[PDB]
C-alpha cells in the first residue's frame, strides 16, 4: 500500500537541476534513479521523505546528453515497489536562462560600453567552473534595450559576446536592460529582463 509518485517535473535554471514530484509522503519513502540509457541507472537520493532530488552533479557531467529519471515508492519504517518514469531532460536544450545582470555601462566620449556580467554555473571543466558564456559559446545572444531617460522611444541591439558599444547623444542620460536568448531553441528561449540601469 504505497502511492506511485506522479507529476514528476524537472526544475532547472543555469543547469542547477532538481527533479520534483508528488505526493508528500505518508508512511513511505522515495528513491530516485537517473540514467542516460537503459541499464545506466544510478540511485542518487535514497529513501527520502523529500519530494525533490537535486541531480545537478549528474547532469553537469554532460549537459548535452538526454537524461531519464525514475522515482520508486517504498513503505516506511513502521509496520513489490512501485515506480514511475520522469519526462526526458536534455540540459543544454532545456535549462532555463537565469536573469542577467549588467556589470557596467561606462560612457567614454560619444560611446557607452555596456558589459554583461558573465554568470558562473555548476558545470565544471579542467577543475574550474564554467560561465554561461563558456557553455553556450555563440549559441547565446544578448539583446540590449536602451532609451533616453528624457524620452519615450526605445532602441535595441544584439551581440554574441558580453558587451555592447553604442553611440549616444552627448549630455543625455540613457537607461539600459539586457535579456539573454538562445536563438536555436523553440521553448524556454529567453531569460527575464535584467534590472534597469540608468546614467546618473
Amino acid at each position: 500500500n504505497t502511492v506511485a509518485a506522479y507529476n514528476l517535473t524537472w526544475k532547472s535554471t543555469n543547469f542547477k537541476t532538481i527533479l520534483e514530484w508528488e505526493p508528500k509522503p505518508v508512511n513511505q519513502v522515495y528513491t530516485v534513479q537517473i540514467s542516460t540509457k537503459s541499464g545506466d541507472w544510478k540511485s542518487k537520493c535514497f529513501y527520502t521523505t523529500d519530494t525533490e532530488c537535486d541531480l545537478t552533479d549528474e547532469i553537469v557531467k554532460d549537459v548535452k546528453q538526454t537524461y531519464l529519471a525514475r522515482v520508486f515508492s517504498y513503505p516506511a519504517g513502521n509496520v513489490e515497489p512501485l515506480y514511475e518514469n520522469s519526462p526526458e531532460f536534455t540540459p543544454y536544450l532545456e535549462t532555463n536562462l537565469g536573469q542577467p545582470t549588467i556589470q557596467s555601462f561606462e560612457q567614454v566620449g560619444t560611446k557607452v560600453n555596456v558589459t554583461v556580467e558573465d554568470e558562473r554555473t555548476l558545470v565544471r571543466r579542467n577543475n574550474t567552473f564554467l560561465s554561461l558564456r563558456d557553455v553556450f559559446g555563440k549559441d547565446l545572444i544578448y539583446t540590449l534595450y536602451y532609451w533616453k531617460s528624457s524620452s519615450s522611444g526605445k532602441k535595441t541591439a544584439k551581440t554574441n559576446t558580453n558587451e555592447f558599444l553604442i553611440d549616444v547623444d552627448k549630455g543625455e542620460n540613457y537607461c539600459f536592460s539586457v535579456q539573454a536568448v538562445i536563438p536555436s531553441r523553440t521553448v524556454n528561449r529567453k531569460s527575464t529582463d535584467s534590472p534597469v540601469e540608468c546614467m546618473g
Epitope: K158, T159, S184, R189
Partner: antibody, heavy 117, light 108 residues
Framework: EVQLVESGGGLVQPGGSLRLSCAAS????????MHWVRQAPGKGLEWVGL????????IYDPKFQDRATISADNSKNTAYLQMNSLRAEDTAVYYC??????????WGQGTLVTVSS | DIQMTQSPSSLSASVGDRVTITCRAS??????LNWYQQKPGKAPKVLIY???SLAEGVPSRFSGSGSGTDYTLTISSLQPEDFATYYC?????????FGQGTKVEIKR
Amino acid sequence: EVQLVESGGGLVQPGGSLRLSCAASGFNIKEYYMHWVRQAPGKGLEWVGLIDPEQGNTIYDPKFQDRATISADNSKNTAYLQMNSLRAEDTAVYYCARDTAAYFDYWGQGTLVTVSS
Amino acid sequence: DIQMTQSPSSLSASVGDRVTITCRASRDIKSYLNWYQQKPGKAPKVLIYYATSLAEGVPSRFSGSGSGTDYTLTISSLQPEDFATYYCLQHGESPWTFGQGTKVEIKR
C-alpha cells in the same frame, strides 16, 4: 504547427488609421520577438517595428515612431499594428513575422491596406 | 541609421549560370546580415542568416559570405525555380534595414 494569420486589411480613408492584427497559433509569442514589415505595390520590403511580448518593449523605425502603435496581448497570443494619418504611400501589403533573434522563421500571409476614398 | 546598398537592382541569367548579389552597409554591421528570397505573391523566405549560415532545408547552391560592411549572396548554379526578388537585411541594431532588392530574371 506554427501559423501567423493577419486580419484587419482593406480600405482606409486618406487621413485614417489602419488597424491590423496578427493571430499566432502553435506557440507562445512571449518566446519570440514579433515584427511588422510592409511592401508597397511593386516596391521593396520596409521594416516598421517589433514588440517583445516578454515585457511589451516596442521599437519603431524612426519613420513611423510618431504615427504608429505596435502592441501585443499574450492571453490572445496576438500582436497588433496601428498606423495613423495614412497617405497614398501607406498603401501596401503588411506582414507579421516571427523573429528568432537569428532570422524571421515564420510569416503571416500578408494583408493589403488600400488608402482610398 | 545604417544604409544598405544592394547591387545590382536586377539581373538576367541562364539556368546553370553562377549568380552573385552584393550588399554594402554604410558602417560595420558585424555579420548580422540575412538574405531572404521572395517569390510572386508570397511572403519572403530566409535563405542565409548571420552572413554565412544556410537555413535549414535551403538548397546548398545558395551561400553567403562577407563581414564588416561587405556581403555577397551566391547561387552557384541557377535553377528555374530561383526566379525571385532577393533582399538583404541588417538586424544587429535598430532600425533594421532592408536592401532595395535584386530581381533575378531567367534567360531561356
